[PDB]
Amino acid sequence: ERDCRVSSFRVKENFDKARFAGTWYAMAKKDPEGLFLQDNIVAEFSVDENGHMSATAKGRVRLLNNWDVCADMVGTFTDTEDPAKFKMKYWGVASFLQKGNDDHWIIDTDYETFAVQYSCRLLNLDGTCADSYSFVFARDPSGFSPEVQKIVRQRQEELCLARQYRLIPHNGYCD
């Protein structure tokens, strides 16, 4: 009875890039297939004078040889015909870290407390998603009141992703 087709999902109305700038702490995530950032994750968003949005990000990750390193990453965003939907190109400061190109959607935000992000890397023949990831971000690395926790859960049900996330530690391991 629920529609899980990716083309039917509602996104943030009248999205505002300049208002989204500044520091964002990751507090929970849903993982995709393969290598991915593990914990101690912080993001910094910026917008230039001509309207182009970009970001940096740091976090610990375990490489192919299980070595434990602090990764320093960089991303740039290209606008589309929906103001909340972007294309993101990304890479690292060290040459052995991963590079690529992903969809980046803002499902909802209030700019001053919380944000919900989503990416579908592959579509099924019937229009639902075959490989996805998602981040829950905070301005304040504290818990979220009861009423904001309830709005975050309603957005996780829209995405057909209820009960598939885990909490992330913050440890000092990276700078």
Residues flagged as binding site for substrate: 98
Distance CA 63, CA 69 (A): 8
Site string for ligand RTL, 47-76 (x = CB under 6 A): --------x-x---x---------x-x-x-
To the nearest whole angstrom, how small is the minimum distance from the Cβ of residue 153 to ligand RTL? 21
Candidates 107, 119, 118; CA nearest to 151 is: 107
- Give the range of 3-11, 12-20, 36-44, 154-162 binding ligand RTL by CB under 6 A: 36-44
Is residue 136 near ligand RTL by the rule CB under 6 A?
no
- Give the range of 2-10, 32-40, 152-160, 163-171 binding ligand RTL by CB under 6 A: 32-40
Is residue 116 near ligand RTL by the rule CB under 6 A?
no
To the nearest whole angstrom, how small is the minimum distance from the Cβ of residue 26 to ligand RTL? 7
To the nearest whole angstrom, how small is the minimum distance from the Cβ of residue 5 to ligand RTL? 23
Task: Catalog residues that contact ligand RTL under the rule CB under 6 A.
Answer: 35-37, 43, 55, 57, 61, 71, 73, 75, 90, 97-98
